[PDB]
Write a protein that binds this ligand. Structure first.
Ligand SMILES: Nc1ncnc2c1ncn2[C@@H]1O[C@H](COP(=O)(O)OP(=O)(O)O)[C@@H](O)[C@H]1O
Ligand SMILES: Nc1ncnc2c1ncn2[C@@H]1O[C@H](COP(=O)(O)OP(=O)(O)O)[C@@H](O)[C@H]1O
Ligand SMILES: Cc1cn([C@H]2C[C@H](O)[C@@H](CO)O2)c(=O)[nH]c1=O
Ligand SMILES: Cc1cn([C@H]2C[C@H](O)[C@@H](CO)O2)c(=O)[nH]c1=O
Lengths: 330, 323
């Protein structure tokens, strides 16, 4: 007759921190929780091109002078678009199923979903990092950001954190895929994920991207340099506009002669703001063992938004996790 | 707060037929009928706002290529996604076919389906883009909220190419092969919507359908090969091109992840009340043909503040997207 209480979590963050490991443990019968893995097979094997080696190979052939730059920036953008696809497909498939009545009930849910990354990772975070590093243009970044899907009510995002030394240790330990392992990339990603956390805190504080936009300095070469510096950003209690994702958009490329952002670009920021609204944000330190890491995330559950879904939707969710694990190489 | 009834129309179709001219006439007070707001093609976004001109860029690419082409097609979609995100908060709900004249009409020059689906599909069919690239684009189609109407422009190909010629320099070539394919693709679009409106789903006839290989792609680029169907079958729709080996397992069964992509496409198109409109008349007559469809179109219930925001949006988009 009645409803299933669901809490959904997107575990997200810089690669190499331990998010996937944590997610599998949480889902393990050793501790009812479903886990949706990174869509590895979609990225690597389902098509003729592997996007992870492709994106690194592009910067390699950029360095070796075989790729004219210019073209590299365009190809880099295209590989980055391909990362998003399976996230967009999964989000489209699951978003009808969670149900409504988002509330912080403080109870154990009937069903917990753990998604490995939210779409914001491939549409915003990784693209923003590539932009800040000079691997991609603002135009290419806009193109990715515009494809972010709106999160419906009840979303929770848990951004993983880890001290730099242990992060480097762990990056050393991942299997060889042909992935780009670059400490400037890592530094930048780490800063961008703090910007994300800060954006969410900024919005929940009742502010909007125009609040402090005037007084904000133009974000040019100097801004980009600082965003690539290890530990230049951190999670803030009350963030400033300058601590969020919005700040990197106050660049000359996006303003008229008189210094004023075009309305069409302002719309792009309004959209970004609205799409993040339903993400209840948390951070989790992963310095512990896998078991302690999962416990850290689990201790957040009673703080999270739950929705009310019906039996048939919850069943479709179980089938979705089963299918996705199977087809993605779990 | 005071209630306002809106009909919105995405006028769409192959470039060169007369869509933009028609929409400008509709917006003009001289066409009478309903007070109409027109949203043009995002020309400046494509051509002048950034360093790279994507129109020149995509055509120059064909003159690694497959990846650059996919990225240019991505950039076409951007301003459409932004505009759709902005305006969808203003249309309101309570979609119905009311039969009566709305308080105002919106005319959008193209729907997001053009840049995320139709043009990518044409490029894929011509071997200029991979299926993987096509999926990437299709996945970014936004869901149409209740009350959308789409009008696909049609025109005999002879007059279509004539229109492109008048406008073209005095020795400038026309990509006849691309235009031939896009005309078929837009018929597939029309057929897809008719197909969905009849309560059918992409799975209907999927098994019986031949895999869409070399022969399918030949037919798809063939001038006049497709048309608007009274009663479309699956093979007349956009769904058919997706039954390809690239998307199937060993047993020739579509992977569930790809099936989900097709479900999403199907749902995203649901709220598009579909029409076609012949544009062989003068611009005044073309505007009248499109406007005569209003009694059959969905309208929504918005309000004065949101309608006012739509007028500002139209004013702004027209200004910022110009030359
Ligand atoms: N809690 C942990 N303690 C020690 N090593 C870990 C821990 N979590 C993950 N690792 C190791 O670090 C590497 C990256 O972990 P992974 O789960 O792939 O990170 P992510 O999913 O964040 O990219 C793997 O080699 C993994 O075995
Ligand atoms: N109704 C019409 N009759 C004759 N020529 C037309 C008509 N409508 C448009 N044209 C011309 O045809 C060309 C294509 O028109 P345009 O409105 O740009 O088409 P589209 O928006 O479909 O790409 C233009 O040169 C235009 O002046
Ligand atoms: C999600 C995502 C991952 N990656 C990279 C980081 C890792 O090397 C690998 C798996 O996350 O793919 C991107 O380059 N872009 C993305 O959008
Ligand atoms: C909307 C759209 C237009 N075009 C081209 C066709 C015309 O030459 C020009 C303007 O519509 O841009 C694309 O290549 N892709 C697209 O997605």
């Amino acid at each position: 007759s009645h409803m299933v209480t669901i809490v959904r979590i997107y575990l997200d963050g810089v690669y190499g921190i331990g998010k996937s490991t944590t997610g599998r443990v949480m889902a393990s019968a050793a501790s009812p929780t479903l886990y949706f893995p990174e869509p590895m097979a979609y990225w690597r094997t389902l098509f003729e091109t592997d996007v992870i080696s492709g994106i690194y190979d592009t910067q390699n052939r950029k360095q070796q002078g075989n790729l004219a730059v210019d073209d590299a920036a365009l190809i880099t953008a295209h590989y980055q678009s391909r990362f998003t696809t399976p996230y967009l497909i999964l989000h489209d498939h699951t978003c009808t199923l969670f149900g409504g009545n988002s509330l912080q009930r403080g109870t154990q849910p009937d069903l917990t979903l753990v998604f490995d990354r939210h779409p914001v990772a491939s549409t915003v975070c990784f693209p923003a990092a590539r932009y800040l590093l000079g691997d991609m243009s603002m135009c290419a970044l806009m193109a990715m950001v515009a494809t972010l899907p709106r999160e419906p009510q009840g979303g929770n995002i848990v951004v993983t954190t880890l001290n730099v030394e242990e992060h480097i240790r762990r990056l050393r330990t991942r299997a060889r895929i042909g992935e780009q392992i670059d400490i400037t990339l890592i530094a930048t990603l780490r800063n961008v994920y703090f910007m994300l956390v800060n954006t969410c805190h900024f919005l929940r504080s009742g502010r909007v991207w125009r609040d402090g936009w005037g007084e904000l300095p133009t974000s040019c070469g100097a801004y980009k340099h600082r965003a690539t510096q290890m530990d230049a950003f951190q999670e803030r209690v009350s963030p400033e506009l300058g601590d969020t994702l919005f700040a990197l958009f106050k660049t000359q490329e996006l303003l008229d002669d008189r210094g004023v952002i075009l309305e069409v670009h302002a719309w792009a920021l309004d959209a970004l703001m609205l799409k993040l609204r339903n993400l209840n944000v948390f951070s989790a330190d992963l310095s512990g063992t896998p078991r302690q890491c999962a416990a850290v995330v689990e201790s957040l559950l009673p703080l999270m938004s739950s929705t009310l879904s019906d039996f048939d939707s919850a069943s479709a969710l179980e089938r979705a996790a089963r299918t996705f694990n199977a087809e993605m190489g779990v």
